[PDB]
Structure formats: structure tokens, C-alpha cells
Design a protein around this ligand. Structure first.
Ligand SMILES: Nc1ncnc2c1ncn2[C@@H]1O[C@H](CSCC[C@H](N)C(=O)O)[C@@H](O)[C@H]1O
Length: 216
């Protein structure tokens, strides 16, 4: 139904933001397969790539291939690249994720229960407070044409507009997935791109960390 798969369109949407803004530190919350990290590491602008996920099993053996290879030594990077996979939750605050340039929450909020969803903005926007946060979730108005909830365009936009004003951000709405008769349904995936206008807290469990060789 979608020429390139919808999950890949979501990944390419974030890659395009990365290409346009060149963030140095990037964290993907709910990274799952690590498929997004693998796409974003293509870009040489990133100096720190990070992944977080509650599911430790989903991260098993997926770190190994993110480490440098013999090619990366022979033809080296300009600056260091550190990659780190963490076993943790977005609801818990971890100081190693402060000062990031971009945080991505792709198809994650729908997996948060009411209680967890009430704490998510207090952490990602409130505590971490990166320069840019991207949250994507499905549009329930596309369904006629496990998730704890299925929000419409208004429901999401109203939650988003309250958060944007609370934690001092500006939110823009877009998406991926053409309808294509009946164009009024909107995109398949709703996207909100938020743009911003010292105790140690190590909660997460770093499952894998690697660093690349470099030379300027
Ligand atoms: N509280 C939480 N903290 C961190 N990760 C969470 C979480 N609740 C759910 N997740 C993770 O979020 C993911 C949802 S699906 C992963 C989506 C992925 N970015 C993609 O577009 O393919 C799962 O990997 C799940 O384990």
C-alpha cells in the first residue's frame, strides 16, 4: 500500500531533519531494532548516537554490528563517533542524556500507559530538554481508509500544544503516508516536530558502547 514501507518513511523523515539541521548528539528513545540509529550514523555530523529501550531482549546482539569495521580504520572519520545502547525507560530520568541536540520518539507514546504518559513530557521536555524533539504516533482517522491508545489529529495536536507551551517549545505538525480519493483523512503517521525557543543520575543500563577511530 506504501511504495517504501511506512516504518522506513518514518526513519527517512528523521534522516532528512538530521541532514537539514546536522545535530551532533542524537538519542532515539524506543529504538527497538536499532534500524534508525543505523540510518542516522551514515551522516558524519553525529558525534554521539544513543539508543534507549525497556526491552533488553530487543537490544541483544544488535550492538555488535554498530562497532567500527576495518574499513572505518583505513578510511577514518573526521571526528569521533560514540554509539551507546541503553536498557531503560523514557519515564525515568538519566543524566547521561542531557544536552542533546535531537531526541526522537518514533511510534513510542502509544505504548505508554496513562501514568507513564503523564510522566513522559516531564522527562523528555522538562529534564532532558534537547534542542529538538520529534514525536510520531498513528492517526486513527486513517484506519477506515499492542497500542494503549489510538489518537486522532486533534487529540495529538492538543496534547502536543499543551506540552509545547509548558516546557517552552514550538510545535509544527506533519506526517507520512498519502491517503491518496478522500484526501481529508490526513497522513497515516502523525508527526510533531518540537523546537526549543547538575546532579549525576545514572539509572539506565548501558548494554553496549563503542567508539570509532578518527583523524582531522
Ligand atoms: N517506557 C519505555 N521506555 C523506553 N522504550 C519503551 C518504553 N515503552 C515501550 N518502549 C519501546 O518502544 C518501542 C515501540 S516500537 C519501536 C518503534 C521504532 N522507533 C520504529 O519506528 O521502528 C519498543 O521497542 C518498546 O520496547
Amino acid at each position: 500500500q506504501f511504495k517504501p514501507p511506512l516504518y522506513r518513511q518514518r526513519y527517512q523523515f528523521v534522516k532528512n531533519l538530521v541532514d537539514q539541521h546536522e545535530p551532533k548528539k542524537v538519542a532515539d528513545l524506543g529504538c527497538g531494532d536499532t534500524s534508525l540509529l543505523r540510518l542516522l550514523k551514515v551522516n558524519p555530523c553525529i558525534e554521539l548516537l544513543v539508543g534507549v529501550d525497556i526491552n533488553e531482549d530487543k537490544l541483544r546482539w544488535r550492538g555488535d554490528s554498530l562497532a567500527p569495521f576495518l574499513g572505518d580504520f583505513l578510511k577514518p572519520r573526521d571526528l569521533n563517533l560514540t554509539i551507546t545502547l541503553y536498557h531503560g525507560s523514557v519515564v525515568e530520568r538519566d543524566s547521561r542524556l542531557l544536552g542533546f541536540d535531537l531526541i526522537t520518539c518514533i511510534e513510542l507514546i502509544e505504548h505508554l500507559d496513562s501514568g507513564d504518559l503523564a510522566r513522559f513530557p516531564e522527562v523528555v521536555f522538562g529534564y532532558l530538554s534537547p534542542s529538538m524533539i520529534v514525536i510520531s504516533t498513528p492517526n486513527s482517522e486513517f484506519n477506515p481508509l499492542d497500542h494503549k491508545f489510538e489518537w486522532t489529529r486533534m487529540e495529538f495536536q492538543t496534547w502536543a500544544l499543551y506540552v509545547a507551551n509548558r516546557y517552552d517549545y514550538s510545535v509544527e505538525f506533519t506526517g507520512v503516508g498519502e491517503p491518496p480519493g478522500a484526501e481529508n483523512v490526513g497522513y497515516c503517521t502523525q508527526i510533531g516536530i518540537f523546537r526549543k525557543n547538575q546532579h549525576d543520575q545514572h539509572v539506565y543500563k548501558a548494554v553496549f558502547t563503542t567508539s570509532y577511530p578518527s583523524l582531522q
